[model samples]
Target chain A: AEESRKRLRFARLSEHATAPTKGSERAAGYDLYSAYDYTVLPMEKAIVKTDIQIALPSGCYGRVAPRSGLAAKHFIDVGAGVIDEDYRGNVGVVLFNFGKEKFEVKKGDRIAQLICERIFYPEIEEVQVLDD
Target chain B: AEESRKRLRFARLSEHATAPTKGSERAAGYDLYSAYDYTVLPMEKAIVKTDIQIALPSGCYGRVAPRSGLAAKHFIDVGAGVIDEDYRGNVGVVLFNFGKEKFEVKKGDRIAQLICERIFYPEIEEVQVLDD
Candidate 1:
């Protein structure tokens, strides 16, 4: 399969670390699980910890995106989710609660999704005009 | 050039439309400008419109990301930024103000960035269990 060509190896930081999973076969991203409990107050942000790191393929980067369920149901969104190519630290999700009520995330909860996308390094030039 | 191979054609919806620009020579994303002024109140959300629509390349999608400067300085974040390959509508940036003060975005202000990423269409298989 095409997915077999792209190997996403995970390094468990702890025994309780859960590897990322996808709800559907053709899903664009893998759901990231939180390793610890967190209570994000209304209009506040919290960094939810994950117990694993990843080894992304070459010429690719990982973007942490908000889960639609979390956003639609709890009004929680994610930020600071750009995982660089060379980052080797434990994965963390920066979730922001944009609603009036506090949001609680229990351990092992799916907080966000990590989409592995191909990196395009543009050779930019400042032209006098762009194409029409 | 490799960037030339990936043609990102834009159709200006208005005369004031500005093509997306990158800050550096090899920036991963292009800065998206707002088409109109918007005042996002504290803990509120606003959809900042762009005056141009895009023609993304085959097997590619656009992801709207928060500029580090905006998040670090003004506490402004983005949401609902998943742009599919076939979307032909005007690109809108969903700005969420998580700060205590109101966030004002002027016309043509660099509100967010559009990261064009290669899409991987996975041929998924439901195994009894995942690999270790």
Candidate 2:
């Protein structure tokens, strides 16, 4: 009876790819894993591949949010994370190493979290003033 | 009428606050503005204030996503962007300048985009295996 919620489907594109998993039951995001080891120099960004793609339910899109633990402890953050519902390419995490030392992401490391969020496509109309 | 959809309400927290606005029709996010001048040196993070508070509809949360223009043109990115539903404090943008030069954020500058996303709070049950 509780299986009526929207489903997130994943398709692995490589042999070593790992499926996204939730860290906790009530967690809003599924942790994404790195498919290969990568190092990002301080103040630099890297497009780390996940080697997997996702199918978000209609009206929903994917957001690659930084895991709080990684951000607070390692000063790593995600960028260019918006995934449209129709995109079929491999999902990549745009990681920025904000720390002074280079951060190494080993294979199978949890790089970022994938959040499936319902989006509203409203017909936006700009006016002189917005409604209060 | 189309007005029956979920509404995003905003409250000005200061005299210089600017309400979030959309850049074009059908844009998924509303552009947030800066209420004060600030600067982010290379590799440093700044929590720039927006001077506005938002009230997203129930079951929805706010994400401060970086505007692509800012990322491409100024090498600016956002971090610590999650806004919980119950937060009442002034919204701030955690900006990181990945460029060699410091990035200046002037008052009324478009800092980030506010995305209101519907979230699913599912009960967690660790299963031995996920369904295909």
Q: Model 2 scores what on Cα lDDT?
A: 0.72
Please state the error at residue A111 of candidate 2 in Å: 4.5
Taking the tens digit of each residue's C-alpha lDDT, what string does model 2 give over A41-125?
Answer: 9999899898887766545667787766777678887873788766768889898888999988899998887775546633333
Docking class of 1: incorrect
Model 1 per-residue lDDT tens digits across residues A1-132? 346436555667776667776545343467788988888999887888887766565555677877767867898878737887657678889988899989989888888877765566343333333342
Best by lDDT: 2
Candidate 2, residues B1-132, lDDT tens digits: the string is 425225566678778988777555343477889999997899988998988776665456667877778877889878737887667678899888889999988999988877756566332332222233
Model 1 error, position B132 (Å) = 16
Per-residue error (Å), model 1, residue A42:
9.6
TM-score of 1: 0.61
